[PDB]
Design a protein around this nucleic acid. Structure first.
Ligand SMILES: [Mg+2]
Ligand SMILES: [Mg+2]
Ligand SMILES: [Mg+2]
Ligand SMILES: [Mg+2]
Ligand SMILES: [Mg+2]
Ligand SMILES: [Mg+2]
Ligand SMILES: [Mg+2]
Ligand SMILES: [Mg+2]
Ligand SMILES: [Mg+2]
Ligand SMILES: [Mg+2]
Ligand SMILES: [Mg+2]
Ligand SMILES: [Zn+2]
Ligand SMILES: [Zn+2]
Lengths: 177, 99, 266, 71, 162, 42, 38
RNA sequence: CACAAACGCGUCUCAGAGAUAAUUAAUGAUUUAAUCUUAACCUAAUUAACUCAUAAUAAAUCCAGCCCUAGAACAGGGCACA
């Protein structure tokens, strides 16, 4: 509370590094919080003219999940400027070629369309797997919770829970499976 | 002409900035802005967004107390709605008339 | 102090050379056909530095090869320092070859034209003859307008360049500009003759670039001759390894040698 | 809480001449071109390269010499 | 449960049916008056693709569906549970309910893309290159429409097309 | 093992110096949350 | 195959199957009865 | 072709992997038969595109003057053999 002016300003406008797991998580919901943190909309001291911005490191990018048939239906279109140089790549193909590109484009779209978008994008770090350099690892402060709960598989359920779950119907003995 | 238009728009811009700051501070306490606002209103606490943003920026303890009060009011309202009982009333849900 | 020599593998690649384009010569085959060969003279080929596979590409290592000798008085301080630490005089053209990790050679090793044997397919990279800022007819081959049917100041103009509705021209539009002074590579050039004494390679077909210019020679990367390096010396040609002097000229199985019985059909 | 990390090492110390050893840790200098310098600064501060370029007379003259200060 | 066992002993084929013990229904259902199993266990408008413990009760070991005349469900719940089972299988749940192929498990393919709430088959939907404008937009369907009657604690309708 | 003061800084040494300054101010009573000077007529 | 908007069986051996996201009337006795819903 | 160059009418070279739309059959329930499956598991025959191996550039702070097959200017390559 009773700090000098320079250290108080430094503490108020200090940058923060956040961690975000991307395994079994929707790109849109990940990008929402990524954009919030990048713009600094989580800080009561936020202002458009101010340079308040926090770094976000997203891991397990290759293990991302799309709801529905977006893997097969969603497309990304680019153009090289040259005639006949317009390409439309499926989401699955784009993820196979570069896992980072999906979440990178999602965050790029969710970010505001001003000139600060490039500046806040340069603060973003995306990694396909849990292989992060120590220089970035030593800067992490906290890890944001996963926006989507990962459902359990059948084999991942414990036997006590399986037994506690009642059997709704009784199969006949004469039937064959 | 732009000066007049921007003077008119300054109130809206500063209100939106205050709302954004309040949303930031409330989500920092794990509470949503509409719920926080409606629960603070239900507690007969007439503080505008400017004062709320100033408190969030400079009075973290006071703003956390306000957020806790709003969450308590929300929980009391939810309990009353679930119960549907006239006799059971929350401590902070009581309404005080003018004096 | 030779580096260890690794056995040849099917997925391995060999290092190239840097030669000088002398000129063109005819060469007749035993079947009566006539081909045109180009003379590439390997004056000074030396391995300068070695770059690790991980630090260069992550798939294949890189070997740096120098060309013919040049003067010290016209090179930069950093280049002179690098050559002083290497122990060799400065070279003219410095090139990088992508080779596999099992075919690496110690820097400072010289290379000879015997690296290629009679009968092989090589790729030649060089800067073609730069024709400067040339017109569109010479550059892209666009046909001109009629010469005397009334055309006014248009005999070599490109004509229409775009469309009215687009209100702009596409970046891929062909326009007059620089022509020739660019690096090009010719693939699948067959080699017929190897002159050991003068270190000369006879490569079939035309070689991009003017005469008396540096040429980067490597093996053919075409899929038809991907595994032709098995019979060739895998690391490089070591004149001291065999302890036997090769003949002055090595010919292919079909080359009609200058000393011939004047073959006649039967 | 965790203890404060302390890093204190002087590898430039020479037993032959401490006077030269002291200047060995101070004679470090480097100069780069504008492009590489801007790229290095952008990489260090996690910003873009467009910020570090200088500005012209028209913008540098109109800056307020004595901006108001609060507090 | 009935199992078919085949024995080969010197150009002789013996086909036999063996009956094994099977689990029975729990003694106390919350609504014994309900004729339908789900409708009497009060799981109607409650289950989803995430609830694997209910979907795994009646499915063949190779992931196949079970006849309604044997199961006993109402037609609507039967269709909803079939849709949920298909969605779970496409999403990657029920790992142990796949046929065992010793020859095909060695040649690995591209890694399985993580997905959930998938409505159509991954191999039958062509990419939408036009995607439509704001007023006319080809929305991407997510989830099965048969699950629109599930309880919504938040109260917001489930977006079936996004 | 009882926290008396805390201080931020760019580096660890500056943060420690600021924490020492905060502790000294708290001990001497010259704090931002102190009693304002009394301007009245006794 | 004939592409149609409405599919109908031309004989008793035609069977309707949903494949590749479309509907197909397949007939083995009469191959000319192959119908594909557009 | 009255320049040492340019030029064609003259000469040399021109490629591997994945992927698919339509359409074929294996295994299999809803619909214990069958059925290529907007049911899964791996399937195999498969258009053109499209990407990727591969290919090219990819050694920073000497540049007054003199040549150049390098070039509008600016740039670039050489000036030790002789
Ligand atoms: Mg007003
Ligand atoms: Mg030229
Ligand atoms: Mg003409
Ligand atoms: Mg005229
Ligand atoms: Mg004329
Ligand atoms: Mg005229
Ligand atoms: Mg336009
Ligand atoms: Mg069957
Ligand atoms: Mg059949
Ligand atoms: Mg490539
Ligand atoms: Mg030069
Ligand atoms: Zn029912
Ligand atoms: Zn028929």
């Amino acid at each position: 509370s009773s700090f000098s002016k320079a250290p108080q300003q430094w503490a108020t406008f200090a940058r923060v590094w956040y961690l975000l797991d991307g395994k079994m998580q929707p790109p849109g919901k990940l990008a929402a919080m990524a954009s919030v943190k990048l713009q600094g909309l989580h800080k009561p001291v936020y202002h458009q003219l101010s340079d308040c911005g926090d770094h976000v490191v997203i891991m397990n990018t290759r293990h991302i999940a799309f709801s529905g048939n977006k893997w097969e239906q969603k497309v990304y279109s680019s153009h090289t400027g040259y005639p006949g140089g317009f390409r439309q790549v499926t989401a699955a193909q784009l993820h196979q070629k570069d896992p980072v590109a999906i979440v990178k484009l999602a965050i790029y779209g969710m970010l505001p369309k001003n000139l600060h978008r490039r500046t806040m994008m340069q603060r973003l770090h995306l990694f396909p797997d849990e292989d992060i350099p120590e220089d970035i690892l030593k800067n992490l402060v906290e890890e944001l919770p996963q926006p989507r709960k990962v459902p359990r598989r059948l084999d991942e359920y414990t036997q006590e829970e399986i037994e506690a779950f009642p059997r709704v119907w009784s199969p006949p003995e004469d039937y064959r499976l | 002409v732009k000066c007049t238009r921007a003077r008119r728009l300054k109130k809206r811009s500063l209100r939106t900035l205050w709302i954004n700051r309040i949303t930031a501070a409330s989500q920092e306490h794990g509470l949503k802005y509409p719920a926080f606002i409606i629960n603070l209103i239900k507690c007969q606490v007439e503080l505008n967004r400017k004062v709320l943003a100033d408190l969030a920026i400079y009075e973290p303890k006071t703003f956390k107390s306000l957020a806790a009060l709003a969450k308590r009011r929300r929980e009391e309202g939810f309990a009353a709605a679930l119960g549907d009982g006239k006799e059971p009333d929350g401590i902070f849900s009581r309404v005080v008339q003018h004096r | 102090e030779p580096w260890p020599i690794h056995p040849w593998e099917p997925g391995s690649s060999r290092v190239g050379l840097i030669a000088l384009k002398l000129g063109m010569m005819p060469l007749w085959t035993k079947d009566g056909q006539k081909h045109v060969v180009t003379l590439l003279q390997v004056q000074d080929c030396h391995v300068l530095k070695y770059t690790p596979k991980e630090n260069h590409n992550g798939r294949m290592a890189a070997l740096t090869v120098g060309g013919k000798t040049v003067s010290h008085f016209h090179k930069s301080a950093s280049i002179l320092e690098f050559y002083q630490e290497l122990g060799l005089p400065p070279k003219q053209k410095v090139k990088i070859f992508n080779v596999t990790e099992n075919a690496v050679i110690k820097p400072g090793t010289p290379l000879y034209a015997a690296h290629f044997r009679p009968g092989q397919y090589v790729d030649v990279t060089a800067k073609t003859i730069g024709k400067g800022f040339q017109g569109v007819m010479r550059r892209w081959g666009f046909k001109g307008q009629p010469a005397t049917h009334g055309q006014t100041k248009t005999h070599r103009r490109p004509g229409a360049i775009s469309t009215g509705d687009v209100a702009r021209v596409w970046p891929g539009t062909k326009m007059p500009g620089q022509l020739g002074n660019i690096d090009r590579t010719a693939f699948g050039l067959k080699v017929w003759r190897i002159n050991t004494k003068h270190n000369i390679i006879y490569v079939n077909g035309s070689v991009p670039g003017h005469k008396n210019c540096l040429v980067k020679i490597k093996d053919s990367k075409l899929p038809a001759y991907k595994d032709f390096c098995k019979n060739l010396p895998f690391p490089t040609y070591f004149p001291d390894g065999d302890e036997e002097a090769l003949p002055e000229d090595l010919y292919d199985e079909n080359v009609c040698q200058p000393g011939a019985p004047s073959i006649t059909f039967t | 809480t965790k203890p404060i990390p302390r890093p204190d090492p002087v590898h430039n110390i020479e037993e032959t001449h401490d006077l030269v050893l002291k200047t060995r840790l101070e004679e470090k200098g480097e100069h780069l071109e504008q492009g590489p310098m801007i790229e290095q600064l952008s990489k260090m501060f996690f910003t873009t390269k467009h910020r570090w370029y200088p500005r012209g007379q028209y913008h540098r003259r109109r800056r307020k010499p004595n901006p108001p200060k609060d507090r | 449960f009935r199992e078919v066992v085949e024995i080969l002993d010197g150009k002789t084929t013996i086909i036999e049916g063996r009956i094994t013990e099977t689990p029975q229904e729990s003694p106390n259902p919350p609504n014994p008056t309900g004729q339908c199993p789900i409708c009497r266990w009060n799981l109607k408008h409650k289950y989803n693709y995430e609830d694997v413990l209910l979907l795994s009760q009646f499915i063949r070991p190779h992931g196949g569906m079970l006849p309604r005349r044997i199961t006993g469900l109402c037609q609507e719940e039967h269709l909803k549970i079939e849709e949920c089972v298909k969605m779970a299988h496409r999403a990657g749940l029920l790992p142990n309910h796949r046929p065992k192929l010793p020859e095909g498990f060695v040649p690995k393919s591209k890694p399985r893309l993580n997905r959930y709430l998938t409505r159509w088959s991954p191999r039958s939907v062509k990419p939408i290159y036009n995607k439509g404008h704001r007023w006319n937009k080809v929305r991407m369907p997510v989830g099965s429409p048969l699950l629109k009657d599930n309880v919504s604690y938040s109260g917001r309708p489930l977006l079936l097309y996004h | 093992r009882k926290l008396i003061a805390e201080g931020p800084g760019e580096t660890v040494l500056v943060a420690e110096e600021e924490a020492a300054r905060v502790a000294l101010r708290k001990l001497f009573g010259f704090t931002e949350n102190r009693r304002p000077w009394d301007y009245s007529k006794p | 195959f004939k592409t149609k908007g409405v599919l109908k069986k031309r004989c008793r051996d035609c069977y309707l199957v949903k494949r590749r996201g479309r509907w197909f009337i397949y007939c083995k006795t009469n191959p000319k009865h192959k119908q594909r819903q557009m």
